[PDB]
């Protein structure tokens, strides 16, 4: 399971590169959303 | 004298690393010490001021003789070095001595024949070994080991040799091991008793 099941080929490489970029961007946006929610969390907890 | 470049000059014996190497910089001197006769590496990507490290080494060091070496440096990038390096200054009893008579430069551009680029490193280590048998403390710096490596790879490809993992031929590890062990502190060979050593630092372009 530690290796995604796909035969080696150039287009496997391209597809995996694209998926890597998409996953990285999605992680960044999700971390941002968590940050904004935590900012609101702290702000309403001011008092 | 004439001495083959691929042969190690013999020595009477080898000695442990005892004396510490000094640099004017505080951080490198205090927390990550070097030794007289040690081996160091440092990245060499663009945008970092390793030229300042070169100047700090050349101005201020326990050593007395220095060798800058080159194996292809993108033309103008080492043209800057050739312009600015001879203008540097020292202090010896207040005398400027900006001639840098403690440095010898060996440089190569990209268009020089591959053999020259490959053999520049061995030329440098031969010269440092000679000036170490003189009886001094010597220091060497390499410009970019990766470019030497790809020059070696190209020379191998010219003769149509079996490529190893990631294309570079099998010589790499053994050659680097030999090259780096060529350094160290020793007692020189000769009737007047004396001693010397060879520090070394190298660059890596990941």
């Amino acid at each position: 399971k530690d290796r995604i099941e796909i035969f080696p080929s150039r287009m496997a490489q391209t597809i995996m590169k694209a998926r890597l970029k998409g996953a990285q961007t999605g992680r960044n946006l999700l971390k941002k959303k968590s940050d904004a929610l935590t900012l609101r969390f702290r702000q309403i907890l001011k008092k | 004298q004439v001495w083959p470049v691929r042969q190690v000059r013999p020595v009477t014996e080898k000695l442990p690393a005892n004396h510490p190497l000094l640099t004017g910089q505080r951080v490198l001197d205090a927390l990550f010490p070097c030794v007289q006769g040690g081996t160091t590496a440092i990245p060499g990507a663009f945008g970092c001021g390793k030229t300042v490290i070169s100047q700090s080494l050349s101005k201020y060091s326990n050593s007395d003789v220095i060798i800058y070496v080159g194996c292809g440096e993108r033309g103008n990038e080492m043209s800057e070095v050739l312009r600015d390096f001879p203008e540097l200054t020292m202090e010896v009893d207040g005398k400027v001595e900006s001639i840098m008579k403690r440095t010898a430069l060996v440089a190569n551009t990209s268009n020089m024949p591959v053999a020259a680029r490959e053999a520049s490193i061995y030329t440098g280590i031969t010269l440092s070994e000679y000036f170490r048998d003189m009886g001094y403390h010597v220091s060497m710096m390499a410009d970019s080991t990766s470019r030497w490596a790809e020059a070696l790879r190209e020379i191998s490809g010219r003769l149509a040799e079996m490529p190893a993992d990631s294309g570079y031929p099998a010589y790499l590890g053994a050659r680097l091991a030999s090259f780096y062990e060529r350094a160290g502190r020793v007692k020189c060979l000769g009737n007047p008793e004396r001693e010397g050593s060879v520090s070394i630092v190298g660059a890596v372009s990941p």
Partner: protein
């Protein structure tokens, strides 16, 4: 010189592919040129490739079709390929081999030169100091080109790079400080190109009154490969003559060296050398180095040479050998992004991944202006922040934004509206670009200009 008569042979041992085996040759030379005469009366030319014993093999540029085994003949120049060169070559066009394409006469040989060229003594190289005006806001303000800096451009296939090159050629020039622009010249070289984008060049460069300082070379795709490999060296040698033997500053432009690499693969396959990485000979690195490192200033001369080649990236792969090695032996790069082309922005330059290694010396107070570096750095940083803020808006919504975020978004929008877009003919001066940058900067309030020293802000912001 040569005083002995030229020789002729008819011994043809055989043919294999584009090569021709001869025999019984007295002291053949390595790369000496020869001519061929088919029995039917056609003329041809070729270059000696390999030599062994009394045998000598020769490649033919125009192809080996129609060669007769016993009724052909050949002649030996007895010498290496030389070029006629002269300063009056401006206004002309050629086909790589030097044969004129337009209706002009043969070039008078003011001098003969060896096409292979020579290496340059590193001791004489002088650090580039000045900057070349290009008329493009992206290339001049956001980035820069020094007198000697070798800057390639990457661009995937099917994107408008020839247009960028043509506009650069049209609007090239020097900064007017107040031995003027007459010293500047251009050598344009296009290889392996369609018949379209060739008529376009030869017409448009004529339509804008600039042939007085241009020396142009064309080599269509259907031409012999040996013409393709030969041409760029010819261009470089004429550039060297015009720049160093005569005091000129020369801007060389090369297009699509990937086809040059293809021709290199061709000649390698002909010689039957074992391919390596991705079917490319290992020594192609040193070959490209030979085609490079013909730039920079030299002591004892007031001239300069500056190379700006273009490349076709296969499938947006930075780790492909061609762009990777080119980066290893060049001092920066300018990117072109597909999304910007889809956004109908005529200059599609994406200035974020691009970088020029010699900014610090190309500009300054004695140069265009003192505030230039500060303005450039501030513009880059705030654009990065603006892209980040658009990403922020992608989720957080417009109502959750601050005034600062609105400033960043508006600045970004106006920036691609004005700073990037130029038009196919708008020749902007450097001062004009800096003025536009200042106008865009004024949108932000005074305090946010963190990258701007206070004195410059007082001088220019009001």
């Amino acid at each position: 010189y040569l005083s002995q008569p030229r020789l002729t042979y008819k011994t043809v041992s055989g043919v294999n592919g584009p090569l021709v085996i001869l025999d019984h040759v007295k002291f053949p030379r390595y790369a000496e040129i020869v001519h061929l005469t088919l029995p039917d009366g056609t003329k041809r030319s070729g270059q000696v490739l390999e030599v062994s014993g009394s045998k000598a093999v020769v490649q033919v540029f125009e192809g080996t079709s129609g060669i007769d085994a016993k009724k052909t003949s050949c002649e030996f120049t007895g010498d290496i390929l030389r070029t006629p060169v002269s300063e009056d070559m401006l206004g002309r066009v050629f086909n790589g081999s030097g044969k004129p394409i337009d209706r002009g006469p043969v070039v008078l040989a003011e001098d003969f030169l060896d096409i292979m060229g020579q290496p340059i003594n590193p001791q004489c190289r002088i650090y580039p100091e000045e900057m070349i005006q290009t008329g493009i806001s992206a290339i001049d303000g956001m980035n820069s080109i020094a007198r000697g800096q070798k800057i390639p451009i990457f661009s995937a296939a099917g994107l408008p790079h020839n247009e960028i090159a043509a506009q650069i050629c049209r609007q090239a020039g020097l900064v007017k400080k107040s031995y003027s622009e007459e010293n500047f010249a251009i050598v344009f070289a296009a290889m392996g190109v369609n018949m379209e984008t060739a008529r376009f060049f030869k017409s448009d460069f004529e339509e804008n009154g600039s042939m007085d300082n241009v020396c142009l070379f064309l080599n269509l795709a259907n031409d012999p490969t040996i013409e393709r490999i030969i041409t760029p060296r010819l261009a470089l040698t004429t550039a060297e003559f015009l720049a160093y033997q005569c005091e000129k500053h020369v801007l060389v432009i090369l297009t699509d060296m990937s086809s040059y690499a293809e021709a290199l693969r061709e000649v390698s396959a002909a010689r039957e050398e074992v391919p390596g990485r991705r079917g490319f000979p290992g020594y192609m690195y040193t070959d490209l180095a030979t085609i490079y490192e013909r730039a920079g200033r030299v002591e004892g001369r007031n001239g300069s040479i500056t190379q700006i080649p273009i490349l076709t990236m296969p499938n947006d792969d930075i780790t492909h050998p061609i762009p990777d090695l080119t980066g290893y032996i060049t001092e920066g790069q300018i990117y072109v992004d597909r999304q910007l082309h889809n956004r109908q922005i005529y200059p599609p330059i994406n200035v974020l991944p691009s970088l020029s290694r010699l900014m610090k010396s190309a500009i300054g107070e004695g140069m265009t202006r003192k505030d230039h570096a500060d303005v450039s750095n501030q513009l880059y940083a705030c654009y990065a922040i603006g892209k980040d803020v658009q990403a922020m808006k992608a989720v957080v919504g417009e109502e959750a934004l601050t005034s600062d975020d609105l400033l960043y978004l508006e600045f970004l929008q106006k920036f691609e509206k004005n700073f990037i877009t130029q038009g196919p003919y708008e020749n902007r001066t450097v001062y004009e670009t800096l003025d536009i940058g200042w106008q865009l900067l004024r949108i932000f309030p005074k305090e946010m200009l963190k990258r701007i020293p206070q004195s410059t802000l007082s001088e220019f912001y009001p």
